[PDB]
Amino acid sequence: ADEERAETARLTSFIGAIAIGDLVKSTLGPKGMDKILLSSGRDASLMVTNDGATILKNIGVDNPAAKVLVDMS
Amino acid sequence: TDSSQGIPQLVSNISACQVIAEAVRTTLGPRGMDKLIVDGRGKATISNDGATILKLLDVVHPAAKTLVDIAKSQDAEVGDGTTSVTLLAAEFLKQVKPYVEEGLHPQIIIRAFRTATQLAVNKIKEIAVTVKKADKVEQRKLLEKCAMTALSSKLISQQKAFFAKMVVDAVMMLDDLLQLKMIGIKKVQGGALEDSQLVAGVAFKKTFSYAGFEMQPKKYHNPKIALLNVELELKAEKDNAEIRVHTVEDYQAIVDAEWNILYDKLEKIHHSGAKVVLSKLPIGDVATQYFADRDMFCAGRVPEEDLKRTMMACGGSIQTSVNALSADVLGRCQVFEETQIGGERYNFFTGCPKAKTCTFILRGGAEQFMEETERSLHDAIMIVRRAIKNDSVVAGGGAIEMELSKYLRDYSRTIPGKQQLLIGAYAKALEIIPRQLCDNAGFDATNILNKLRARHAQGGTWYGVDINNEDIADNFEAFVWEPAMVRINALTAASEAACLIVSVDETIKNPR
Amino acid sequence: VEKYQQLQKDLSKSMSGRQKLEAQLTENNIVKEELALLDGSNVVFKLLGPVLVKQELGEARATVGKRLDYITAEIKRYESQLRDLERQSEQQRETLAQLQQE
Amino acid sequence: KSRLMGLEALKSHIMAAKAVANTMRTSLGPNGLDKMMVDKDGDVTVTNDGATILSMMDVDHQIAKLMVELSKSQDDEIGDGTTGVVVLAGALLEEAEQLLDRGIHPIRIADGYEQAARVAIEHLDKISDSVLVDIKDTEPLIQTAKTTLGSKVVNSCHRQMAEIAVNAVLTVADMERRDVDFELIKVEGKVGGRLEDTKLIKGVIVDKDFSHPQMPKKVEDAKIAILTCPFEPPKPKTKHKLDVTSVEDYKALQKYEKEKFEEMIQQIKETGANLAICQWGFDDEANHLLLQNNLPAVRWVGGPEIELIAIATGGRIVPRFSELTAEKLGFAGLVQEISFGTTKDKMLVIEQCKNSRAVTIFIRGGNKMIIEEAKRSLHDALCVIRNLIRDNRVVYGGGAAEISCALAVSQEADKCPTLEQYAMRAFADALEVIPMALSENSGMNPIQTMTEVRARQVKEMNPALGIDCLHKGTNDMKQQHVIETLIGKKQQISLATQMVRMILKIDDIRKPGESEE
Amino acid sequence: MLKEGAKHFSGLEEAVYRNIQACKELAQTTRTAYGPNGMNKMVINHLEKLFVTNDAATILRELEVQHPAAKMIVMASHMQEQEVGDGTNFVLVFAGALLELAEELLRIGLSVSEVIEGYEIACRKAHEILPNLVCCSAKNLRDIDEVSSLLRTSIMSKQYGNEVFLAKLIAQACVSIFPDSGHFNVDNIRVCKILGSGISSSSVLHGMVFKKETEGDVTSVKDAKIAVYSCPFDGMITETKGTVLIKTAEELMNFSKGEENLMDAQVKAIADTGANVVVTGGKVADMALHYANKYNIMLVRLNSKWDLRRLCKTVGATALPRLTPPVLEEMGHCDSVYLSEVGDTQVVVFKHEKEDGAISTIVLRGSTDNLMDDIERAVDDGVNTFKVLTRDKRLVPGGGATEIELAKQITSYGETCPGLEQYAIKKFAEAFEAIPRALAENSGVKANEVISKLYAVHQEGNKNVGLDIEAEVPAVKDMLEAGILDTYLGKYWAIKLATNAAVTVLRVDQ
Amino acid sequence: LHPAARMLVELSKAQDIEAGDGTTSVVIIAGSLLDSCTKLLQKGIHPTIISESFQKALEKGIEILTDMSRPVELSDRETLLNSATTSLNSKVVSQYSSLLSPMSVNAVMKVIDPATATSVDLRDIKIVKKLGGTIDDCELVEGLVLTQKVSNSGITRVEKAKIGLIQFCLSAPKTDMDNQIVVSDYAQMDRVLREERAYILNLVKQIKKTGCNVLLIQKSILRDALSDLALHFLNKMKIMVIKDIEREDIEFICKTIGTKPVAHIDQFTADMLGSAELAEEVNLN
């Protein structure tokens, strides 16, 4: 219903997926540094992960890039 | 307990009058800028007239709401002048708003209005020209021209000259109207413009295929036409119901019984005589099998108006019950034919036992020339049928106004004073009307109007702007042709619309 | 209309047997006192069926308890069937009443 | 109950086409980056042309409204060039306010644009070949389905669909005498197969009903029996209680099942087509007890299907099993039991050379996205040939005509003069927008890129060559084989000024307080 | 007040200043609303219904004012209109004009009773020379032109244009048909507008004009035993059942069948109660109607309470809902009961016309009711301007000629009387020029031109103004000698009634 | 609900079960490091670098730390007494603890098999209480003190007692109350009443036939129910019926004294039947 045109979207599609590709790579690696998982559904209910698949689950993210990159990873 | 007196209320009157006038302004002219009006239900309105869009528009001004009647009063009587009168009484209300402030405010306003139109309506009716069946024309060449004339503005192809003679004859056939509702142009997929058609009865744009549809008769030298407000299908009479099964006869049972009552519905009308069963609603899977097995024609989704227009041409009746119908609520032709022009299977209903209806079959199946020709043909009707009605005919595009506005300002020097301006400005009020079509024809109206003023002065037959040509000329000679009476009507409508309101700066408004 | 009645009918029907249980239930308690009171001081007797069986004390109390219990359960049996038969009447009433009427 | 003034409203109207045509401008062709959709209901999707997106996108404004409106007829017939007029009519739209900004009638500008299409029409008329034939048009439809099957689902043209595109449209085309209807040709995906499972279907395809495969799987005759009646005791796809009040009625049922099986095996066979489409559902038990008898029995059929395949055959349906005639049976040119996918059931493909009053060509997919991405190819590739048989006329597209048709019109300007030259000038320029805009969406500098075939347009005329649409280092429309139905381009031509011609219609920009409400 | 106390919305400024202005603005409206005028005043109803009238009460009724000042007086114009036709549009403006002279006297500082009485004093003096202003009287109430000469005035006093044929058709309506000897009936004379044809096409059908459709066969007999019923057929069936259609199925086929002969019963019992016409405030019932077609009972499918009213009124009828076989109570009156087509609509007609029960019902053809309404406004007045119930009305100059006559007279006396009484009596004879100023506007001239000549014409009882060019420069019409005259009566009332309030309305400071 | 604050409510909570000691103090330890952290973060040391330095160093710490501590005999309940009591008197609660220290270390010394005295989990050890009583009425108990009892005719004192579990209903299934009834009429009830009565006695019978001297019946909600009269018929079987008992205590009596869950007559087995050398209820102290 609503056109999202090139650059401002390409920021949004980036900046989220930019934000997405980080706290995963933060965690990613053996010395990849953990990210606290946050379930806003249950209080803050938490883990602290090296897994981005968990990251997607706990805090729901909306980026089309993400939703793609969600499916990819 | 609300109201206001005073010129502010009077100015409040003209405040609305000019604005709503601006709407219709060229709305009936070919061009403008349109606002499609989608209504809170989601209902889009592009309407060529302001009137329908005025039908949409609330008027907080009883003053401007009167013209809603008057423009409609000029709309209902004709269908034109709605725009025009809307551009006139306002133009009046335009003119005198200073004159009021200039002191014309007393009732010499409304006292002067009457003779003004009274002057014209005689001078109006006199200059108009009458024709016969042998006179200037077959009486067809009148309509031929007047259809050609209306087929002119949108240029399409030159077959507009040939389409002219087409529409004339059904126009001859009914002419129980200035309006075209009982004839109508049916845009017909397939064919060419050059081959168009005119039905001597109704006919249906598209009827749809079913089981054995090429089987179901497309040809009757007479039908019995079942006009159905309702449909028939397996969803109308269930094809689906369960049963508790012991012998598989139980499987055979619930299927067989259901199949009947669908066929009951239609055989009762099939045995009520209907060879043409017209459901303006679809026919479903199992029901049309019966229609297919009956070997009597049925039609699903056929136009309700054409279905209504049928009982105009065919003298039929809409059958809201499908059960145990009869032949009088049926309908007739002395030809039911059906054939697919282009892609639309097209019912042919003619030889009808009567006609309240013909219809015009426009082919080429093409979006462009046809929609214009239609819009052009509709006014041919507005002319050619009214040309039939009134053979005395006059010419537009300033073929009159100059002379009129001349004739008036001519008499101004006798008056001079307040109503002298009513001799001059009532004169003035005329030429904004063609001033729209010079916008539409892409001209400067002024010098167009200027010379034609002089060329009704030094001239004085029909000289005036022609948007059809996009030129100026003697317009009756340009064959710009409309009867006189429609003038007098708009004249009476316009001159009366104003004078009432100028007599009112005093308007009482109460919730109680 | 007859459809409305059977549901009213079966209502108080299966209502009838369910009530007298409580008096039996009541006397089931009345005998428990006495089955707690009797050691078998004088010969204890169940009677179920046209035979009068030889009855022993210890088996009698658990019986009448079960009898108490079995009966006590049977307040629920129709209290299910109560609303059952009660409802199907009411549903048809306004219909069948008006059906009786017109 | 507030009212914009003319130009104002149009200035308010011109605020519409810009972005919505813009969406096309980086989406034009394969070098155009195609369109994406997301939903308030939470569905992110890719969209295409105008119609797909502009229907999936929702249109606020009468301009935007007319888009889908103006759009339909395009993709209906030709199917290719849909996204084009959006840019184009939007360009001319921005040419219109411009000439109003240049102080020229909204009236007049829309005037000289109309026949400005003609000098582009006559210009287009000349372009490329106004001819194609069966063995010929095979190859451009190859090319057409090259760029069709190579621009959308896969970038690899898969010659199957590329040929599946040519044949069944011909099948309805050669039936209709160099006429064909996009309704009749139909593109049907069903996933679980592959985008490399692609089927030319001139008849109906439905999963052959097996309440048992082992009880013989077979297809019989070439012909189909379309039945509202039972080919085995009937049932309307709704639960039918199977109980037996005694232990003995347990014995008689399966006999009754088989007594009517063989009887309906009898009475439908004597009617014809032992394969019989029974509109009715039925128990998987006894359905395979007829299968146990014989003749795989089609049950739980869609109510539409029977009449759908009926009308396609041109034959009727048996409404009542006591009524038996082969015309109330269907007509299969070939009934063929066909395994649907490697993943799942055999279907029964009814391929109708008897009569096909519908032709539903088939494809499968590894995903529902790609399979519809593929149908997206298929429909419009079937749409070009649709007209492209009605006229075999084709014009090398992609900006070569745009750079060219502008030649006639903008040169027709000072041939015209007064207002028409403007309405020739601000007209034709809108054409070269797209090769610009195609160079835009490419990595290409458009004015530069446009300048090139320009020199060509001075060097040569109406290049069958042109600029790379594929963004090929070489620039033709020949080497690119970018050529569109010389209908469709002009069909596309018909659309653009019409919209501007639409936005002007009457003088009423007023609203009651209802405009878009 | 200064305190928290009591209740008043008048006094201090209000009494002096604001009441007078509350006594002003609407009189200001009525100024060209009365007398010959081209003034027109749009009005919307509680219906929000756009309409134009120079009649006050129509406008008045929907006007609310916190003051009684504007409020209370309007009853007088009604008290007037209770007596007669127009002159009512003159009543208030006469007050308001002469009033605001007193606030000037209040500026000049004249005491209430000092301001009060000189008017009252001269109010006699008006009424005293008012008979000296009788220039004619009403000869033949049967004659058209005898009467049309008058009727033109209140219509003129309403509106200038249409007055003539109105004044004709109203006597062609035959105000003749009553003695008007003290016997005159505007229940037997009703204005019934056909929407259709023209208003020059508007007729007068003597006998009740009911544009309501004459339903089925016409009256049993013309001396119609009339059954006027608010709801004579509401339907005889009740379908409530198991399904409120069928549950026990045959129980349906009883009542839809058993309903209609109860409508027959009722309709037969319409023939049995004896009504030569039955009248339905509620709906017609078709079978009943068919039975009433069998029984040939004239019927009215639907009846306005207005219908039912006049029906209940003149017939002696009583409109009743009846689910029962009906009972004549309503009975008859009218001895001829017909069907007419005027504007080509079925007109239920009732005529007994006895010269006393005599029904002459004006039937207005016209294509607009608002048209026929602002018409009927003046038409309302003309008949009851004709209705004096003096066959000899002592016809006095119409149009306001008598005004200037006593302007000289009573202020010349107002001169003669001494004291602060003077201006009281002097302002009195100055109250005339208001309308000679008011209509002079719509006429298009200043009032000095008017009044100086209206003075310089001196004693005439003819020479006067209105909406005219004669009203412009000459300050001369014949508001006597042309056929525009007035009954002596409403004069006395239009004079007196307003003088009372103008006195009285000031005295109350509360 | 702050998560690093959650870590804290997580932190000492473990130290509760980790010890029950230094739990307040393991709050005191954490921040001190975290105090040193932002420093290293103001220095910018890396969280991996920061981390791996530390738990390592803790090892490095605990070593030197370890020898500071003095190994004391864990076989000697007195040395156990002394140290713990010295601990207890080096620590907060000596009031009853030191009085209860002969109890504490003993049940421990009981569940102490090794001279090592291992970890000594509290599992087999069962804390019980009795309203009132006395701190002297406190005692260790060598076999499970159980909540109340069910004896109608049931055995009060039973010994060497095979302890039955019931995970099945003994009443017959509950139909309209506890038992099997179908009646709209008394003929209906009087006929089928034969069925329910007799079998529940049989299902009762087989239990004692399965060699249950004690019966653990978990709660009648953890049950369908036991009809007390058939249970009186079962109490007539002179089994020791403990009914309405926690599944936990069932599991405790399962894990600890070895009465494993019995959901069926066949599922009565000596493994699922604990042996109570004396099971007798006591009212006193």
From Swiss-Prot, chain A:
Residues annotated as binding ATP: 29
List of residues binding ADP: 29
Residue positions where Phosphoserine is found in the record: 45
Domain of life the protein comes from: Eukaryota
Cellular localisation: Cytoplasm
Assembly with partners or alone: Component of the chaperonin-containing T-complex (TRiC), a hexadecamer composed of two identical back-to-back stacked rings enclosing a protein folding chamber. Each ring is made up of eight different subunits: TCP1/CCT1, CCT2, CCT3, CCT4, CCT5, CCT6A/CCT6, CCT7, CCT8. Interacts with PACRG. Interacts with FLCN. Interacts with DLEC1. Interacts with SVEP1.
Family per similarity comment: Belongs to the TCP-1 chaperonin family.
Function, in words: Component of the chaperonin-containing T-complex (TRiC), a molecular chaperone complex that assists the folding of actin, tubulin and other proteins upon ATP hydrolysis. The TRiC complex mediates the folding of WRAP53/TCAB1, thereby regulating telomere maintenance. As part of the TRiC complex may play a role in the assembly of BBSome, a complex involved in ciliogenesis regulating transports vesicles to the cilia.
Name the record gives this protein: T-complex protein 1 subunit beta
Gene behind the chain: CCT2
Curated annotation (Swiss-Prot), chain B:
Known outcome of mutating residue 367 to K: Found in a patient with developmental delay, intellectual disability, pyramidal and cerebellar signs, cerebellar vermis hypoplasia and hypoplasia of the corpus callosum; uncertain significance
BP terms from Gene Ontology: binding of sperm to zona pellucida; chaperone mediated protein folding independent of cofactor; chaperone-mediated protein folding; positive regulation of protein localization to Cajal body; positive regulation of telomerase RNA localization to Cajal body; positive regulation of telomere maintenance via telomerase; protein folding; protein stabilization
Keyword Isomerase appears in the UniProt entry: no
Annotated keywords: Acetylation, ATP-binding, Chaperone, Cytoplasm, Hydrolase, Isopeptide bond, Methylation, Nucleotide-binding, Ubl conjugation
PROSITE patterns per UniProt: TCP1_1, TCP1_2, TCP1_3
Subcellular localization, as worded in the UniProt entry: Cytoplasm
Pfam families reported for this sequence: Cpn60_TCP1
UniProt-annotated binding residues for ATP: 29, 81, 84, 386, 397, 487
Residues that hold Mg(2+) according to the record: 80
Modified residues (N6-acetyllysine): 55, 238, 308
The enzyme's E.C. designation: 3.6.1.-
Binding site for ADP: 29, 81-84, 152-153, 397, 482, 487
Main location: cytoplasm
CDD domains in the record: TCP1_eta
Reaction(s) catalysed by this chain's protein: ATP + H2O = ADP + phosphate + H(+)
Any one GO MF annotation of this record: ATP binding
Enzyme class (EC, first level): hydrolase
CC terms in the record's Gene Ontology section: cell body; chaperonin-containing T-complex; cytoplasm; cytosol; extracellular exosome; microtubule
InterPro entries to which the protein is assigned, alphabetical: Chap_CCT_eta, Chaperone_TCP-1, Chaperonin_TCP-1_CS, Cpn60/GroEL/TCP-1, GroEL-like_apical_dom_sf, GROEL-like_equatorial_sf, TCP-1-like_intermed_sf, TCP-1_chaperonin
Keyword Protein biosynthesis among record annotations: no
Domain of life: Eukaryota
Family: Belongs to the TCP-1 chaperonin family.
PANTHER family: CHAPERONIN
Name used for this protein in its record: T-complex protein 1 subunit eta
Organism, as annotated: Homo sapiens (Human)
Gene responsible for this protein: CCT7
From Swiss-Prot, chain C:
GO BP annotations, alphabetical order: chaperone-mediated protein complex assembly; chaperone-mediated protein folding; negative regulation of amyloid fibril formation; protein folding; protein stabilization
Crosslink feature (Glycyl lysine isopeptide (Lys-Gly) (interchain with G-Cter in SUMO2)) location: 54
Record flagged with keyword Ubl conjugation: yes
Swiss-Prot/TrEMBL keywords: Acetylation, Chaperone, Isopeptide bond, Ubl conjugation
Coiled coil start-end: none
GO cellular component: cytoplasm; prefoldin complex; protein folding chaperone complex; RPAP3/R2TP/prefoldin-like complex
Positions of crosslink type Glycyl lysine isopeptide (Lys-Gly) (interchain with G-Cter in SUMO1): 54
GO molecular function terms listed in the Swiss-Prot or TrEMBL record: amyloid-beta binding; protein-folding chaperone binding; unfolded protein binding
Top-level taxon of origin: Eukaryota
Family: Belongs to the prefoldin subunit beta family.
Function: Binds specifically to cytosolic chaperonin (c-CPN) and transfers target proteins to it. Binds to nascent polypeptide chain and promotes folding in an environment in which there are many competing pathways for nonnative proteins.
Subunit structure: Heterohexamer of two PFD-alpha type and four PFD-beta type subunits. Component of the PAQosome complex which is responsible for the biogenesis of several protein complexes and which consists of R2TP complex members RUVBL1, RUVBL2, RPAP3 and PIH1D1, URI complex members PFDN2, PFDN6, PDRG1, UXT and URI1 as well as ASDURF, POLR2E and DNAAF10/WDR92.
Protein name: Prefoldin subunit 6
Included stretch of the parent chain: 13 to 114 of 129
Curated annotation (Swiss-Prot), chain F:
Cellular location(s): Cytoplasm; Melanosome; Cytoplasm, Cytoskeleton, Microtubule organizing center, Centrosome; Cytoplasm, Cytoskeleton, Cilium basal body
Gene Ontology cellular component terms for the protein in this record: cell body; cell projection; centrosome; chaperonin-containing T-complex; cytosol; extracellular exosome; melanosome; microtubule
Broadest EC class assigned to this enzyme: hydrolase
Catalytic reaction equation(s): ATP + H2O = ADP + phosphate + H(+)
Residues at which ATP binds: 22-23, 91
Annotated positions binding Mg(2+): 21
Catalytic activity, EC: 3.6.1.-
BP GO annotations: binding of sperm to zona pellucida; chaperone mediated protein folding independent of cofactor; chaperone-mediated protein folding; positive regulation of protein localization to Cajal body; positive regulation of telomerase RNA localization to Cajal body; positive regulation of telomere maintenance via telomerase; protein folding; protein stabilization
Modified residues (Phosphoserine): 101, 119
Residues annotated as binding ADP: 22-25, 89-91
Modification N6-acetyllysine, positions: 205, 219, 236, 243
SUBUNIT field: Component of the chaperonin-containing T-complex (TRiC), a hexadecamer composed of two identical back-to-back stacked rings enclosing a protein folding chamber. Each ring is made up of eight different subunits: TCP1/CCT1, CCT2, CCT3, CCT4, CCT5, CCT6A/CCT6, CCT7, CCT8. Interacts with PACRG. Interacts with DNAAF4. Interacts with DLEC1.
Family listed: Belongs to the TCP-1 chaperonin family.
Name of the protein: T-complex protein 1 subunit delta
Organism the protein comes from: Homo sapiens (Human)
Gene: CCT4
Parent-protein residues present: 84 to 368 of 539
